Write a protein that binds this DNA or RNA. Structure first.
Ligand code: MG
Ligand code: MG
Ligand code: MG
Length: 628
RNA sequence: CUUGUUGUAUAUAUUCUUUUAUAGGUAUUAAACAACGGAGAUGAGGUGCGCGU
DNA sequence: TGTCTATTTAGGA
DNA sequence: ACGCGCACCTCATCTCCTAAATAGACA
């Protein structure tokens, strides 16, 4: 289907950040009006006004005065049962005839058709569509029993209606036939919807009225669609623009209709659309009408779209393999037994076991676990327990981590020497992934420390915390996000996350290409033990009630007793030898860090996007990914 | 225009950074592999801090 | 006026 | 754990990536 390619402009282009800011301001004004009138005006009033003030006989007014829409609320313009172009034209010409979004023109004098009607307004409408089309009135799924209340009958009714947009009586029958005509249908499941189809006929007025009342209910707490302040992107639809190859070059020139003249924007070339390739001809033959101007690191990029589908060359089925996700010793664990059958596979656990320096530090249990993994096809020896030794310098695994790192980097040097590029990049990315995750943890912890220090030195005082209007104004005037300190830390975090994402992509590509280049025709990615952080001191005092309680006899939940028996909390006593404050000892303050270190790699290494990367690699590869 | 973005060097120098220290910044040298459907919005989860239980 | 750019309208019955 | 705020991050879901005809601008 559709595809994208991004180009970088070469030289100085009139499209600056001010053009994009103007675009976004118009977007937000239009969205503000649309939000504030989602129910205050009906479609018939709009169509009647357009008929009166212009007197035109067009379908977008004949479709706004018919019996269906002449009195329904404006938000039905955004639903899938109303013609798209009629909704667009009716809404746009209403807004244009009344100057609702305040359009006073644009800086570059780009044609209003490409900037306003098929630009920011087009995005506003396409955005308000997804809000209302996914709009799931408050509802859940429950098993329908014979002795179930009227709500249970009605909830599963409307729940399936939303999932299938069925309105007429006949459409209910069609969904009943949807599964029955399919081989081996579930008899009980379809009857569950047949019963509600029967219920649909009894009191349809109550059903439709309640569904629309709920829809109106979920459209007054909606604050509208908002384009953020960090976007730096504008989209223009232009029917007639020209993209041309340069003369004696690899780049392109974009001829953009701009102030009634053709402005030429020079673009660099991509090795992605490169000279003499089929993708180049496809791009230059079938490119779409949407142009996206985006600024990234103070550089202007231009995104075009086109149609290109490659011809998948199949291969004979050989094997199917299961990939499992783990978090303890290695990320990727296979069900195969490593017999050196795989070509281009380096077994790093089996390599770490051939060094006396490493296994001499191992116990009998640890050595047994490592030998278990060495016989298994595994990838990415991310060892979370040893990795924390780089942060905690007093960890009992501090020397194991050093030997692991030294041996892994020695293997990296050896692979670089022997010109084994694929395995070399794999090992480099593994090492860099470990280092970069330690860096990300350090940066995130510094972010937390800096936020805490800023919000304690700021000293918020709230007269009433029940609602925003009663709290301190500096909560919103001067956040920590707007402090210079945060932007530096957030930029560093973004850079580290970028490196982490790249290294994980490299490892995933390595795994996929080993299994592809060995005959495996499916890699069935077989589809989370959060360590618990010690309860905080404020939780220890104001929540677990360890304040003014006797130190000798502590009335608390047994988990707190076990934590106190460990040297985690140091308690500060008073004249009565009872607790008035507490702190973290070294042991507890580092237990908290260990728990955070283990939990953050769950949410930072994108382990719920691994399947996505394998799918994308299967979009152009000899292997397929079967979800388990 | 040996041309876009991102990853991959435990490279040379540094009176740089503990807010990326087995890594980065500032300047160089050195590449060859690889991935590349984006933009926008909404919703749901999780998380940190602060103020109250 | 001729040519090139911008604006309009698109239905379901 | 709960509430109110301020943020941050990862996921899921959806829309949209047209085209002919007419009107207008200006030499
Ligand atoms: Mg980087
Ligand atoms: Mg590169
Ligand atoms: Mg150095």
């Amino acid at each position: 289907m559709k595809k994208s390619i991004k180009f970088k402009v070469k030289g100085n282009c009139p499209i600056t950040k001010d053009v994009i800011n103007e675009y976004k301001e118009y977007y937000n004004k239009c969205s503000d009006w649309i939000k504030n009138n989602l129910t205050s005006i009906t479609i018939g009033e709009m169509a009647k006004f357009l008929q009166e003030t212009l007197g035109k006989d067009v379908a977008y007014i004949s479709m706004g005065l018919s019996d269906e829409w002449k009195d329904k609320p404006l938000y039905h313009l955004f639903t899938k049962k109303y013609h798209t172009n009629n909704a667009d034209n009716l809404l746009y010409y209403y807004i244009k005839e009344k100057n609702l979004d305040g359009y006073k023109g644009n800086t570059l004098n780009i044609g209003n058709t490409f900037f306003r009607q098929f630009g920011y307004f087009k995005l506003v409408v396409s955005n308000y569509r997804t809000k209302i089309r996914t709009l799931n009135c408050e509802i859940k799924r429950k098993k329908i029993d014979a002795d179930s209340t009227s709500e249970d009958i009605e909830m599963q009714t409307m729940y399936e209606i939303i999932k299938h947009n069925l309105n007429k009586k006949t459409d209910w029958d069609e969904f009943i036939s949807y599964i029955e005509n399919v081989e081996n249908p579930n008899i009980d499941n379809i009857n569950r919807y047949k019963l509600l189809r029967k219920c649909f006929c009894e009191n349809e007025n109550m059903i439709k009225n309640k569904l629309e009342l709920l829809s109106i209910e979920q459209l007054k707490n909606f604050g509208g669609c908002i384009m953020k302040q960090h976007i730096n992107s504008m989209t223009l639809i232009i029917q007639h623009f020209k993209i041309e190859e340069k003369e004696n070059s690899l780049g392109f020139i974009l001829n953009l209709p701009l102030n009634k003249k053709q402005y030429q924007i020079e673009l660099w070339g991509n090795r992605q659309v490169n000279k003499g390739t089929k993708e180049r001809d496809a791009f230059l033959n079938t490119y779409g009408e949407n142009i996206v101007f985006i600024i990234n690191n103070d550089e202007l990029y231009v995104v075009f779209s086109y149609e290109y589908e490659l011809e998948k060359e199949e291969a004979n089925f050989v094997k199917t393999v299961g990939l499992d996700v783990n978090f303890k010793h290695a990320f990727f664990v296979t069900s195969e037994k490593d017999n050196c059958h795989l070509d281009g596979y380096i077994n790093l656990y089996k390599y770490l076991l051939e060094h006396d320096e490493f296994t001499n530090l191992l116990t009998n249990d640890e050595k047994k676990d490592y030998e278990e993994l060495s016989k298994v096809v595994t990838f990415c020896p991310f060892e979370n327990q040893l990795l924390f030794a780089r942060y905690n310098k007093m960890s009992k695994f501090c020397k194991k981590e050093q030997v692991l790192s030294k041996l892994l980097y020695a293997l990296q040097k050896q692979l670089k020497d022997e010109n084994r590029t694929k395995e070399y990049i794999y090992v480099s990315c593994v090492n860099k992934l470990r280092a970069k995750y330690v860096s990300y943890f350090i940066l995130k912890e510094k972010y937390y420390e800096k936020q805490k220090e800023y919000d304690i030195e700021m000293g918020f005082v709230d007269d009433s915390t029940e609602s925003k209007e009663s709290m301190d104004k500096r909560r919103t005037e001067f956040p920590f996000r707007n402090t210079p300190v945060a932007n530096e830390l957030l930029s560093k975090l973004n850079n580290v996350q970028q490196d982490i994402n790249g290294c994980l992509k490299n490892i995933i590509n390595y795994i996929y290409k080993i299994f592809e280049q060995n005959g495996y025709k499916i890699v069935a990615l077989e589809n989370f033990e959060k360590k618990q952080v010690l309860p905080t001191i404020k939780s220890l005092l104001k929540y677990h009630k360890l304040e003014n309680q006797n130190v000798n006899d502590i009335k608390a939940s047994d988990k707190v007793k076990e934590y106190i028996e460990n040297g985690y909390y140091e308690l500060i006593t008073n004249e009565n030898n009872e607790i008035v404050d507490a702190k973290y000892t070294e042991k507890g303050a580092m237990k908290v860090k260990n728990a955070n270190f283990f939990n953050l790699m769950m949410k930072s290494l994108h382990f719920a996007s691994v399947k996505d990367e394998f799918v994308l690699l299967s979009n152009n590869g000899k292997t397929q990914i079967a979800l388990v």
